[PDB]
């Protein structure tokens, strides 16, 4: 989305240890400016998590964005591998 509007999908508490907060966030990855980078987790009907909260370094994040494989967040990847 553009300008000032529905950005709530970005400012959720993506996981129990979510460190991203609308009131304090600043860019970290080279690809960020005013919004946190996110990754789609294929668990169940799927959900989005903050890349930063998954403790992913930039190169890993970039590889994920370029690949066609499914991603499972730290909370669900173990269930997916079982």
């Amino acid at each position: 989305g553009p300008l000032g509007s529905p950005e709530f999908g970005y400012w959720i508490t993506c996981c129990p240890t979510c460190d991203v907060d609308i009131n304090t966030w600043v860019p970290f990855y080279s690809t960020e400016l005013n919004k946190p980078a996110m990754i789609y987790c294929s668990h169940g009907d799927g959900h989005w998590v903050h890349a930063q909260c998954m403790d992913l370094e930039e190169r890993t994040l970039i590889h994920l964005s370029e690949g066609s494989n499914k991603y499972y967040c730290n909370e669900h990847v173990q269930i997916a591998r079982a």
């Binding site: 980078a37 996110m38 990754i39 789609y40």
Partner: peptide, 9 residues
């Protein structure tokens, strides 16, 4: 995987 805000700066 699908991602948001990952376009090269």
């Amino acid at each position: 995987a699908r991602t948001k805000q990952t376009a090269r700066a």
